[PDB]
Amino acid sequence: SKYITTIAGVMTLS
Amino acid sequence: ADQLTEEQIAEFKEAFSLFDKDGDGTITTKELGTVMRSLGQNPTEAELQDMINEVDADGNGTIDFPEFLTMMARKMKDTDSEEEIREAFRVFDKDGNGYISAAELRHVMTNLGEKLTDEEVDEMIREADIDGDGQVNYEEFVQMM
Ligand SMILES: [Ca+2]
Ligand SMILES: [Ca+2]
Ligand SMILES: [Ca+2]
Ligand SMILES: [Ca+2]
């Protein structure tokens, strides 16, 4: 799974 | 080393579908805002455009899968501010106890529109868990980024 990492990844764009 | 595999690609493509709510192959600002708010954030229209912009390599306004994969390849390598990752951790750690449980991950994924069995949930915890306590603490969340 890469859900948690992409969720956190997207958070980081902010 | 720095190389994503065939299965790592397929996992990112799956993750991409969380954000691409209509499956047209692009994340719009509108889709980003709905994901953001489903994670307790409240970015403005301009903030959403700025987010898309850091990732939108071709300047067309939306994030396609290649652009998403690029950002994710890069984010896997780089290190973030302690408080960027702290805010990410807090979205999962709903009760503030310092541990992401399976239930908490299940809640986040559900709020994101995701259909997860608890064998799929436990397995996500399994991948991020270092000490083997069956939960994800802050240190393990960090290392995961
Ligand atoms: Ca879309
Ligand atoms: Ca684009
Ligand atoms: Ca917790
Ligand atoms: Ca653990």
- As a whole number of angstroms, the distance between CA B100 and CA B94 comes to 8
Q: Residue B75, Cβ neighbours under 10 Å: how many?
A: 19
Q: Which of B29, B45, B80 is where one domain is finished?
A: B80
The reply to whether B47 and B97 lie within a common domain is: no
B59 and B49, same domain (yes or no): yes
- Taking a C-beta distance cutoff of 8 angstroms, is the pair B72, A9 a contact? yes
Domain count, chain B: 2
Q: Could you tell me if B14 and B75 lie in one domain?
A: yes
> Among B85, B20, B119, B56, which Cα is nearest to A4's?
B85
Query: End of a domain among B80, B102, B133?
Result: B80
Question: Which residue among B29, B50, B80 closes a domain?
Answer: B80
Q: Which of B5, B12, B120 to mutate to test binding with chain A, by most A CBs within 10 Å of its CB? A: B12
Identify which of A2, A8, A12 has the shortest CB distance to residue B11.
A2
Q: Which residue range is the domain that position B118 belongs to?
A: 81-145
Are residues B91 and B47 part of one domain? no
Q: Vertex B80, ends B78 and B82: CA angle to 5°? A: 150
B83: Cβ contacts below 8 Å, ≥ 6 apart: none
- How far is CA B40 from its chain centroid? 13
Question: Is residue B30 a contact partner of residue B44, using CB atoms and an 8 Å limit?
Answer: no
The Cα-based distances of B141 to B51, B52, B138 in angstroms read 22, 24, 5
Report the candidate in B64, B88, B63 with the shortest Cα–Cα distance to residue B145. B88
Per-residue DSSP letters for B90-123? HHH-TT-SSEE-HHHHHHHHHHTT----HHHHHH
Q: Is B79 left (phi over 0), alpha (psi -120 to 50) or beta?
A: beta
- Can you tell me whether residue B132 is helix, strand or coil? coil
Residues B56 and B95 in one domain: no
Same domain, residue pair B12 and B42: yes
Phi, psi of B26 (to 5 degrees): -130, 140
Report residue B10 CA to chain centroid gap. Answer: 15
| Nearby residues for ligand 1 (ion, Cβ within 5 Å) | B 20, 22, 24, 26
Q: How remote is the C-alpha of B134 from its chain's centroid?
A: 20
Burial B30-46 (b: 16+ CB within 10 A, else e): ebbbebbebbeeebeee
